Amino acid sequence: GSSGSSGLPLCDSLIIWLQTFKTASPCQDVKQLTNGVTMAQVLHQIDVAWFSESWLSRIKDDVGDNWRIKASNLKKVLHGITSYYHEFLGQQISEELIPDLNQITECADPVELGRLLQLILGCAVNCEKKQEHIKNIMTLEESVQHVVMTAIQELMSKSGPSSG
């Protein structure tokens, strides 16, 4: 491989964060994450309570030569987070954060792919072990820490109450 950036910041940075997870599937370019396995594997690391082997066991990697298998996964990955915002936290997710899987599996756009990563980073900053991750950010590159840190703030601003 080689060193170099590509795509918007929200994604050009989020990736550097997901890199900390050397899961069965690495995280280099957006075209490598589009699969969904990488992300899913990361979710299990954040909290097994909501992401246990039982769930991650539904994700496949064969996507390599299959594009249909990708979506199937990307779906679970997202659904696994969203619910974690309405169930665990209780809040919801704005269409602004809602990752367009269809646009990530068919188009694989960097602007969309970055969104999916945001959801994962947001849940990792609102949990018990969250701290264990927060440190992984301060270790990243200054410029990176910024974007990675911004996402969190955007996750609290976009969030919306239910009643009361």
N, CA, C and O of each residue as an XYZ file, in Angstrom:
656
protein
N       0.806     -1.206      0.000
C       0.000      0.000      0.000
C       0.842      1.260      0.000
O       2.061      1.200     -0.163
N       0.193      2.405      0.183
C       0.889      3.686      0.198
C       0.154      4.695      1.075
O      -0.989      4.469      1.473
N       0.819      5.807      1.372
C       0.231      6.849      2.206
C      -0.409      7.934      1.346
O       0.194      8.415      0.387
N      -1.633      8.314      1.699
C      -2.336      9.340      0.951
C      -3.795      9.451      1.348
O      -4.429      8.453      1.691
N      -4.328     10.667      1.303
C      -5.720     10.906      1.667
C      -6.604     10.969      0.425
O      -6.110     11.141     -0.690
N      -7.909     10.830      0.626
C      -8.862     10.868     -0.476
C     -10.296     10.912      0.044
O     -10.680     10.111      0.897
N     -11.079     11.851     -0.475
C     -12.461     11.982     -0.052
C     -12.641     13.041      1.019
O     -11.668     13.503      1.615
N     -13.889     13.426      1.264
C     -14.193     14.440      2.268
C     -13.483     14.133      3.583
O     -12.952     13.039      3.770
N     -13.479     15.115      4.497
C     -12.840     14.973      5.809
C     -13.588     14.001      6.715
O     -12.991     13.089      7.287
N     -14.895     14.202      6.839
C     -15.725     13.342      7.676
C     -15.367     11.874      7.471
O     -15.513     11.058      8.382
N     -14.899     11.546      6.272
C     -14.518     10.176      5.947
C     -13.001     10.033      5.884
O     -12.448      9.006      6.280
N     -12.336     11.069      5.384
C     -10.882     11.059      5.269
C     -10.228     10.970      6.645
O      -9.020     10.759      6.755
N     -11.034     11.134      7.689
C     -10.532     11.078      9.057
C     -11.127      9.889      9.806
O     -10.415      9.155     10.491
N     -12.437      9.707      9.670
C     -13.130      8.609     10.332
C     -12.406      7.287     10.096
O     -12.282      6.467     11.006
N     -11.931      7.089      8.871
C     -11.217      5.869      8.517
C     -10.011      5.655      9.424
O      -9.792      4.555      9.931
N      -9.232      6.714      9.625
C      -8.050      6.643     10.474
C      -8.405      6.143     11.870
O      -7.589      5.505     12.536
N      -9.624      6.438     12.305
C     -10.088      6.016     13.623
C     -10.441      4.534     13.626
O     -10.041      3.794     14.525
N     -11.191      4.106     12.617
C     -11.598      2.709     12.504
C     -10.389      1.806     12.288
O     -10.469      0.592     12.477
N      -9.272      2.405     11.890
C      -8.045      1.654     11.650
C      -7.562      0.978     12.928
O      -6.930     -0.078     12.882
N      -7.862      1.594     14.068
C      -7.458      1.054     15.359
C      -7.931     -0.385     15.526
O      -7.329     -1.164     16.266
N      -9.013     -0.731     14.835
C      -9.567     -2.078     14.908
C      -9.017     -2.954     13.785
O      -9.422     -2.825     12.630
N      -8.093     -3.842     14.134
C      -7.487     -4.740     13.158
C      -8.362     -5.968     12.932
O      -7.859     -7.058     12.663
N      -9.674     -5.782     13.041
C     -10.620     -6.874     12.848
C     -10.240     -7.723     11.640
O      -9.389     -7.334     10.841
N     -10.876     -8.883     11.514
C     -10.607     -9.786     10.401
C     -10.488     -9.018      9.089
O      -9.772     -9.437      8.178
N     -11.192     -7.895      8.998
C     -11.168     -7.072      7.795
C     -10.583     -5.695      8.091
O     -11.089     -4.965      8.944
N      -9.506     -5.344      7.373
C      -8.829     -4.054      7.540
C      -9.669     -2.888      7.030
O     -10.725     -3.090      6.429
N      -9.195     -1.672      7.273
C      -9.904     -0.473      6.838
C      -8.943      0.526      6.203
O      -8.325      1.333      6.898
N      -8.822      0.466      4.881
C      -7.933      1.365      4.154
C      -8.728      2.440      3.420
O      -8.766      3.595      3.845
N      -9.361      2.053      2.318
C     -10.156      2.983      1.525
C     -11.646      2.699      1.687
O     -12.038      1.603      2.087
N     -12.470      3.694      1.374
C     -13.917      3.552      1.485
C     -14.411      2.341      0.702
O     -15.353      1.665      1.117
N     -13.770      2.073     -0.430
C     -14.143      0.942     -1.273
C     -13.868     -0.379     -0.562
O     -14.323     -1.436     -0.999
N     -13.120     -0.311      0.536
C     -12.786     -1.503      1.307
C     -13.751     -1.684      2.473
O     -13.939     -2.796      2.966
N     -14.358     -0.587      2.909
C     -15.304     -0.625      4.019
C     -16.722     -0.883      3.518
O     -17.541     -1.472      4.224
N     -17.002     -0.437      2.297
C     -18.320     -0.621      1.701
C     -18.877     -2.006      2.014
O     -20.090     -2.186      2.122
N     -17.983     -2.979      2.157
C     -18.386     -4.348      2.457
C     -19.327     -4.386      3.658
O     -20.422     -4.943      3.582
N     -18.891     -3.791      4.764
C     -19.706     -3.769      5.965
C     -19.120     -4.614      7.079
O     -19.317     -4.321      8.258
N     -18.398     -5.665      6.705
C     -17.782     -6.555      7.682
C     -16.894     -5.781      8.648
O     -17.025     -5.911      9.865
N     -15.990     -4.975      8.099
C     -15.080     -4.179      8.913
C     -15.832     -3.428     10.005
O     -15.525     -3.568     11.189
N     -16.817     -2.634      9.600
C     -17.614     -1.862     10.547
C     -18.266     -2.776     11.580
O     -18.071     -2.603     12.784
N     -19.038     -3.746     11.103
C     -19.715     -4.687     11.986
C     -18.761     -5.233     13.043
O     -19.062     -5.207     14.236
N     -17.611     -5.726     12.595
C     -16.613     -6.279     13.504
C     -16.242     -5.270     14.585
O     -15.990     -5.640     15.732
N     -16.210     -3.994     14.211
C     -15.870     -2.932     15.149
C     -16.964     -2.750     16.195
O     -16.679     -2.527     17.372
N     -18.214     -2.848     15.758
C     -19.353     -2.695     16.657
C     -19.262     -3.675     17.822
O     -19.512     -3.311     18.971
N     -18.902     -4.918     17.517
C     -18.775     -5.950     18.540
C     -17.717     -5.566     19.570
O     -17.810     -5.943     20.738
N     -16.712     -4.816     19.129
C     -15.637     -4.383     20.012
C     -16.121     -3.299     20.969
O     -15.702     -3.248     22.126
N     -17.003     -2.434     20.479
C     -17.544     -1.352     21.291
C     -18.349     -1.896     22.466
O     -18.157     -1.479     23.609
N     -19.249     -2.829     22.177
C     -20.083     -3.434     23.210
C     -20.712     -4.731     22.711
O     -21.469     -4.730     21.740
N     -20.393     -5.833     23.381
C     -20.926     -7.137     23.006
C     -22.383     -7.278     23.432
O     -23.120     -8.102     22.890
N     -22.790     -6.470     24.405
C     -24.159     -6.503     24.903
C     -25.161     -6.326     23.767
O     -26.213     -6.965     23.751
N     -24.827     -5.457     22.820
C     -25.698     -5.196     21.680
C     -25.129     -5.814     20.407
O     -25.864     -6.087     19.458
N     -23.818     -6.031     20.394
C     -23.151     -6.615     19.237
C     -22.337     -7.841     19.641
O     -21.114     -7.772     19.761
N     -23.024     -8.959     19.848
C     -22.368    -10.200     20.242
C     -22.086    -11.076     19.026
O     -22.652    -10.865     17.953
N     -21.208    -12.058     19.202
C     -20.851    -12.966     18.117
C     -22.096    -13.453     17.383
O     -22.052    -13.733     16.185
N     -23.204    -13.552     18.111
C     -24.461    -14.010     17.530
C     -24.891    -13.102     16.382
O     -25.378    -13.574     15.355
N     -24.707    -11.800     16.565
C     -25.076    -10.825     15.546
C     -24.028    -10.771     14.440
O     -24.350    -10.908     13.260
N     -22.774    -10.570     14.830
C     -21.677    -10.498     13.870
C     -21.574    -11.787     13.062
O     -20.902    -11.832     12.032
N     -22.246    -12.831     13.537
C     -22.229    -14.123     12.859
C     -23.114    -14.097     11.618
O     -23.093    -15.025     10.809
N     -23.891    -13.028     11.474
C     -24.785    -12.880     10.333
C     -24.101    -12.119      9.201
O     -24.600    -12.081      8.076
N     -22.957    -11.516      9.508
C     -22.205    -10.757      8.516
C     -21.269    -11.664      7.724
O     -20.654    -12.575      8.279
N     -21.167    -11.408      6.423
C     -20.305    -12.199      5.553
C     -19.228    -11.326      4.917
O     -19.376    -10.107      4.830
N     -18.146    -11.958      4.475
C     -17.045    -11.239      3.843
C     -16.928    -11.611      2.369
O     -16.273    -10.913      1.594
N     -17.566    -12.713      1.990
C     -17.533    -13.177      0.608
C     -17.841    -12.035     -0.357
O     -17.530    -12.115     -1.545
N     -18.452    -10.976      0.163
C     -18.801     -9.819     -0.652
C     -17.709     -9.515     -1.672
O     -17.983     -8.980     -2.746
N     -16.473     -9.861     -1.327
C     -15.357     -9.619     -2.223
C     -15.755     -9.712     -3.683
O     -15.498     -8.796     -4.464
N     -16.385    -10.822     -4.052
C     -16.819    -11.033     -5.428
C     -18.329    -10.854     -5.555
O     -18.882    -10.937     -6.652
N     -18.988    -10.608     -4.428
C     -20.433    -10.419     -4.413
C     -20.793     -9.018     -3.927
O     -20.320     -8.574     -2.881
N     -21.632     -8.330     -4.693
C     -22.056     -6.980     -4.340
C     -23.357     -7.008     -3.547
O     -23.647     -6.088     -2.782
N     -24.136     -8.069     -3.733
C     -25.407     -8.215     -3.034
C     -25.183     -8.504     -1.553
O     -25.903     -7.991     -0.696
N     -24.182     -9.327     -1.262
C     -23.862     -9.684      0.115
C     -23.456     -8.456      0.922
O     -23.609     -8.426      2.143
N     -22.938     -7.446      0.231
C     -22.513     -6.212      0.880
C     -23.687     -5.528      1.572
O     -23.677     -5.339      2.789
N     -24.696     -5.160      0.790
C     -25.879     -4.500      1.329
C     -26.426     -5.254      2.536
O     -26.637     -4.670      3.599
N     -26.654     -6.553      2.365
C     -27.180     -7.385      3.440
C     -26.490     -7.065      4.762
O     -27.136     -6.980      5.806
N     -25.174     -6.888      4.708
C     -24.394     -6.579      5.901
C     -24.595     -5.125      6.319
O     -25.058     -4.846      7.425
N     -24.243     -4.205      5.428
C     -24.384     -2.779      5.702
C     -25.682     -2.495      6.452
O     -25.733     -1.616      7.311
N     -26.726     -3.246      6.119
C     -28.026     -3.078      6.762
C     -27.936     -3.376      8.255
O     -28.254     -2.526      9.086
N     -27.500     -4.587      8.587
C     -27.365     -4.996      9.980
C     -26.477     -4.023     10.750
O     -26.788     -3.649     11.880
N     -25.373     -3.619     10.130
C     -24.442     -2.688     10.757
C     -25.152     -1.411     11.192
O     -24.995     -0.958     12.326
N     -25.933     -0.836     10.284
C     -26.669      0.390     10.575
C     -27.765      0.136     11.604
O     -27.828      0.807     12.634
N     -28.627     -0.835     11.317
C     -29.720     -1.179     12.219
C     -29.199     -1.433     13.630
O     -29.874     -1.128     14.614
N     -27.996     -1.992     13.721
C     -27.407     -2.277     15.016
C     -27.092     -1.019     15.800
O     -27.135     -1.020     17.031
N     -26.776      0.057     15.088
C     -26.453      1.327     15.727
C     -27.716      2.125     16.033
O     -27.987      2.458     17.187
N     -28.485      2.428     14.991
C     -29.719      3.186     15.148
C     -30.470      2.761     16.404
O     -30.738      3.579     17.284
N     -30.807      1.477     16.481
C     -31.531      0.944     17.629
C     -30.797      1.262     18.929
O     -31.420      1.467     19.970
N     -29.470      1.300     18.858
C     -28.651      1.589     20.027
C     -28.827      3.039     20.471
O     -28.444      3.409     21.581
N     -29.408      3.852     19.595
C     -29.633      5.261     19.893
C     -31.049      5.488     20.413
O     -31.289      6.393     21.213
N     -31.981      4.660     19.953
C     -33.374      4.768     20.372
C     -33.665      3.829     21.539
O     -34.620      4.034     22.288
N     -32.835      2.801     21.685
C     -33.006      1.831     22.761
C     -32.138      2.192     23.963
O     -32.647      2.588     25.011
N     -30.827      2.052     23.801
C     -29.887      2.362     24.873
C     -30.012      3.821     25.300
O     -30.497      4.119     26.392
N     -29.571      4.725     24.432
C     -29.632      6.154     24.719
C     -31.075      6.651     24.708
O     -31.481      7.420     25.579
N     -31.841      6.205     23.718
C     -33.231      6.612     23.615
C     -33.455      7.633     22.516
O     -34.534      7.693     21.927
N     -32.433      8.437     22.240
C     -32.526      9.462     21.206
C     -32.693      8.831     19.828
O     -32.822      7.613     19.705
N     -32.688      9.668     18.796
C     -32.840      9.191     17.426
C     -31.715      9.714     16.540
O     -30.818     10.413     17.010
N     -31.770      9.371     15.257
C     -30.756      9.808     14.306
C     -31.375     10.625     13.178
O     -32.381     10.226     12.590
N     -30.768     11.770     12.881
C     -31.260     12.646     11.825
C     -30.871     12.110     10.450
O     -29.812     11.505     10.287
N     -31.736     12.338      9.466
C     -31.483     11.878      8.106
C     -30.100     12.316      7.632
O     -29.576     11.792      6.649
N     -29.516     13.279      8.338
C     -28.195     13.788      7.989
C     -27.114     12.756      8.304
O     -26.101     12.674      7.611
N     -27.340     11.974      9.353
C     -26.387     10.948      9.762
C     -26.720      9.607      9.118
O     -25.840      8.772      8.911
N     -27.995      9.408      8.803
C     -28.445      8.170      8.179
C     -27.601      7.833      6.954
O     -27.722      8.474      5.911
N     -26.738      6.814      7.092
C     -25.860      6.370      6.006
C     -26.631      5.694      4.876
O     -27.395      4.758      5.108
N     -26.424      6.176      3.656
C     -27.098      5.617      2.490
C     -26.381      4.365      1.994
O     -25.521      4.439      1.115
N     -26.739      3.219      2.563
C     -26.128      1.951      2.179
C     -26.250      1.720      0.677
O     -25.281      1.343      0.018
N     -27.446      1.949      0.143
C     -27.693      1.768     -1.282
C     -26.715      2.592     -2.114
O     -26.312      2.182     -3.203
N     -26.338      3.755     -1.593
C     -25.407      4.636     -2.288
C     -23.963      4.268     -1.963
O     -23.030      4.757     -2.600
N     -23.788      3.403     -0.970
C     -22.457      2.969     -0.562
C     -22.098      1.629     -1.196
O     -20.921      1.304     -1.355
N     -23.119      0.858     -1.554
C     -22.911     -0.447     -2.170
C     -22.974     -0.353     -3.690
O     -22.303     -1.107     -4.395
N     -23.783      0.577     -4.188
C     -23.932      0.768     -5.626
C     -23.014      1.881     -6.126
O     -22.482      1.808     -7.233
N     -22.835      2.907     -5.300
C     -21.983      4.036     -5.657
C     -20.698      4.027     -4.837
O     -19.617      4.305     -5.357
N     -20.822      3.706     -3.554
C     -19.670      3.661     -2.662
C     -19.096      5.056     -2.434
O     -17.909      5.208     -2.145
N     -19.945      6.069     -2.568
C     -19.523      7.450     -2.378
C     -18.869      7.635     -1.011
O     -19.306      7.051     -0.020
N     -17.811      8.459     -0.968
C     -17.076      8.739      0.269
C     -17.890      9.573      1.252
O     -17.755      9.423      2.466
N     -18.735     10.450      0.719
C     -19.573     11.307      1.550
C     -20.566     10.484      2.363
O     -20.902     10.839      3.492
N     -21.031      9.384      1.779
C     -21.987      8.511      2.450
C     -21.272      7.534      3.380
O     -21.630      7.402      4.550
N     -20.260      6.854      2.850
C     -19.494      5.890      3.631
C     -19.062      6.490      4.965
O     -19.133      5.832      6.003
N     -18.616      7.742      4.929
C     -18.182      8.410      6.141
C     -19.279      8.489      7.185
O     -19.011      8.413      8.384
N     -20.518      8.642      6.728
C     -21.658      8.734      7.631
C     -21.788      7.468      8.474
O     -21.916      7.536      9.696
N     -21.754      6.317      7.812
C     -21.869      5.036      8.500
C     -20.844      4.927      9.625
O     -21.160      4.467     10.722
N     -19.618      5.355      9.343
C     -18.546      5.309     10.333
C     -18.860      6.215     11.518
O     -18.514      5.904     12.658
N     -19.518      7.337     11.241
C     -19.878      8.288     12.286
C     -20.764      7.629     13.338
O     -20.524      7.766     14.538
N     -21.787      6.915     12.881
C     -22.709      6.236     13.784
C     -21.955      5.329     14.752
O     -22.257      5.293     15.945
N     -20.974      4.601     14.230
C     -20.175      3.698     15.050
C     -19.343      4.471     16.068
O     -19.216      4.058     17.221
N     -18.779      5.592     15.633
C     -17.959      6.425     16.506
C     -18.811      7.089     17.582
O     -18.356      7.295     18.708
N     -20.049      7.422     17.228
C     -20.946      8.058     18.175
C     -21.329      7.140     19.318
O     -21.376      7.561     20.473
N     -21.604      5.880     18.996
C     -21.987      4.899     20.005
C     -20.799      4.539     20.891
O     -20.973      4.109     22.032
N     -19.595      4.717     20.359
C     -18.378      4.411     21.102
C     -18.002      5.558     22.035
O     -17.047      5.454     22.805
N     -18.758      6.648     21.960
C     -18.505      7.814     22.798
C     -19.660      8.060     23.762
O     -19.707      9.086     24.440
N     -20.590      7.111     23.816
C     -21.746      7.225     24.698
C     -21.983      5.921     25.455
O     -23.116      5.598     25.812
N     -20.909      5.179     25.695
C     -20.999      3.911     26.410
C     -20.099      3.915     27.641
O     -19.489      4.932     27.971
N     -20.022      2.772     28.315
C     -19.198      2.645     29.511
C     -17.715      2.626     29.152
O     -16.922      3.382     29.712
N     -17.351      1.756     28.216
C     -15.965      1.636     27.779
C     -15.585      2.789     26.855
O     -14.425      2.927     26.467
N     -16.568      3.612     26.507
C     -16.337      4.754     25.631
C     -14.951      5.348     25.867
O     -14.217      5.627     24.919
N     -14.602      5.538     27.134
C     -13.303      6.098     27.493
C     -12.172      5.324     26.822
O     -11.250      5.916     26.262
N     -12.252      3.999     26.886
C     -11.234      3.143     26.285
C     -10.982      3.535     24.832
O      -9.901      3.298     24.294
N     -11.989      4.135     24.204
C     -11.878      4.559     22.813
C     -11.438      6.016     22.723
O     -10.543      6.356     21.949
N     -12.072      6.871     23.518
C     -11.745      8.292     23.528
C     -10.237      8.508     23.467
O      -9.759      9.421     22.794
N      -9.493      7.663     24.173
C      -8.039      7.760     24.197
C      -7.451      7.455     22.823
O      -6.464      8.066     22.413
N      -8.063      6.510     22.118
C      -7.600      6.126     20.790
C      -7.655      7.312     19.831
O      -6.968      7.327     18.809
N      -8.475      8.302     20.169
C      -8.617      9.491     19.339
C      -7.469     10.467     19.575
O      -6.833     10.931     18.629
N      -7.211     10.772     20.842
C      -6.137     11.690     21.204
C      -4.801     11.208     20.649
O      -3.867     11.993     20.488
N      -4.717      9.913     20.359
C      -3.495      9.327     19.825
C      -3.355      9.612     18.334
O      -2.243      9.704     17.813
N      -4.487      9.751     17.654
C      -4.490     10.028     16.222
C      -3.774     11.340     15.919
O      -3.280     12.011     16.825
N      -3.723     11.699     14.640
C      -3.067     12.931     14.219
C      -3.936     14.146     14.536
O      -5.145     14.133     14.307
N      -3.308     15.192     15.065
C      -4.024     16.413     15.415
C      -5.173     16.669     14.444
O      -6.342     16.643     14.831
N      -4.831     16.916     13.184
C      -5.832     17.181     12.157
C      -6.959     16.154     12.220
O      -8.133     16.497     12.081
N      -6.591     14.893     12.430
C      -7.570     13.815     12.512
C      -8.451     13.967     13.745
O      -9.678     13.978     13.643
N      -7.820     14.084     14.908
C      -8.548     14.235     16.163
C      -9.685     15.241     16.014
O     -10.756     15.070     16.595
N      -9.442     16.288     15.232
C     -10.446     17.322     15.006
C     -11.717     16.725     14.411
O     -12.773     16.736     15.044
N     -11.607     16.205     13.193
C     -12.748     15.603     12.513
C     -13.390     14.519     13.372
O     -14.608     14.490     13.542
N     -12.561     13.630     13.909
C     -13.047     12.543     14.751
C     -13.785     13.082     15.971
O     -14.761     12.487     16.430
N     -13.313     14.211     16.491
C     -13.931     14.831     17.658
C     -15.197     15.586     17.266
O     -16.161     15.635     18.030
N     -15.187     16.172     16.073
C     -16.333     16.924     15.581
C     -17.560     16.031     15.444
O     -18.649     16.384     15.896
N     -17.377     14.873     14.817
C     -18.469     13.927     14.623
C     -19.315     13.799     15.886
O     -20.535     13.959     15.845
N     -18.659     13.510     17.005
C     -19.351     13.362     18.279
C     -20.294     14.534     18.532
O     -21.481     14.341     18.798
N     -19.758     15.746     18.447
C     -20.553     16.949     18.666
C     -21.759     16.982     17.732
O     -22.866     17.325     18.147
N     -21.536     16.624     16.472
C     -22.605     16.614     15.481
C     -23.644     15.546     15.811
O     -24.811     15.667     15.439
N     -23.211     14.504     16.511
C     -24.102     13.414     16.892
C     -25.044     13.847     18.011
O     -26.148     13.319     18.144
N     -24.599     14.809     18.813
C     -25.405     15.316     19.918
C     -26.336     16.429     19.447
O     -27.415     16.624     20.005
N     -25.910     17.154     18.418
C     -26.704     18.250     17.875
C     -27.847     17.719     17.015
O     -28.988     18.165     17.138
N     -27.531     16.766     16.146
C     -28.529     16.171     15.266
C     -29.561     15.382     16.066
O     -30.744     15.368     15.725
N     -29.105     14.729     17.130
C     -29.989     13.938     17.977
C     -31.280     14.695     18.272
O     -31.306     15.925     18.261
N     -32.349     13.948     18.535
C     -33.630     14.565     18.829
C     -34.402     13.815     19.897
O     -34.421     12.584     19.910
N     -35.047     14.565     20.802
C     -35.834     13.985     21.895
C     -37.111     13.315     21.397
O     -37.488     13.465     20.234
N     -37.771     12.578     22.284
C     -39.003     11.882     21.933
C     -40.220     12.624     22.478
O     -41.090     13.050     21.718
N     -40.272     12.773     23.797
C     -41.383     13.461     24.446
C     -40.986     13.941     25.838
O     -40.368     13.205     26.606
N     -41.347     15.181     26.155
C     -41.021     15.740     27.454
C     -39.849     16.700     27.394
O     -39.453     17.256     28.418
